[PDB]
């Protein structure tokens, strides 16, 4: 469960990195979806 | 208004950099399992992005 949660946190961090990358292209819809997914995941 | 449009490019651009910075801060916060901070940062990032 500890390692599991740590992986969930890794996934949130990865999504945030993906969003940062998308924004280098001003790819707003991609970054919106990735941030939304990171937030939904962090909530649950 | 070349200058005024450049101001806009710089401002919307400043907003995008702030969104990226908030995401970076959230990544760092999560290294400390600091969920409330990361949640606030991602929320602010998403709100700023929706304003563009």
Curated annotation (Swiss-Prot), chain A:
Subunit architecture: Homodimer (in cytoplasm). Interacts with VPS4; the interaction requires the dimeric structure of VTA1; 6 homodimers of VTA1 appear to associate with the dodecameric VSP4 complex; the interaction is ADP-dependent. Interacts with SNF7; the interaction requires DID2. Interacts with DID2. Interacts with VPS60; the interaction occurs at he endosomal membrane.
Dimerization: region residues: 1-44
Entry function: Has a role in the formation of the multivesicular body (MVB). Required for the sorting of lipids to form intralumenal vesicles and for fluid-phase transport to the vacuole. Required for sorting the plasma membrane proteins STE2 and STE3 into the MVB. Acts a cofactor of VSP4, promotes the oligomerization of VPS4 and stimulates its ATPase activity by 6- to 8-fold.
Family to which this protein belongs: Belongs to the VTA1 family.
Stretch list, region Interaction with VSP4: 5-44
Compartments (UniProt record): Cytoplasm; Endosome membrane
Effect of substituting residue 27 to A: Abolishes interaction with VSP4 and dimerization
Source species of the chain: Saccharomyces cerevisiae (strain ATCC 204508 / S288c) (Baker's yeast)
Residues of the full protein shown: 286 to 329 of 330
Protein's name according to its UniProt entry: Vacuolar protein sorting-associated protein VTA1
Superkingdom classification of source: Eukaryota
Note: Present with 4400 molecules/cell in log phase SD medium.
Variant or mutagenesis effect after changing residue 37 to A: No effect on interaction with VSP4
């Amino acid at each position: 469960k500890i390692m599991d949660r740590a992986s969930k946190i890794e996934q949130i961090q990865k999504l945030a990195k993906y969003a940062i990358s998308a924004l280098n292209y001003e790819d707003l819809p991609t970054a919106k979806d990735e941030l939304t997914k990171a937030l939904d995941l962090l909530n649950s």
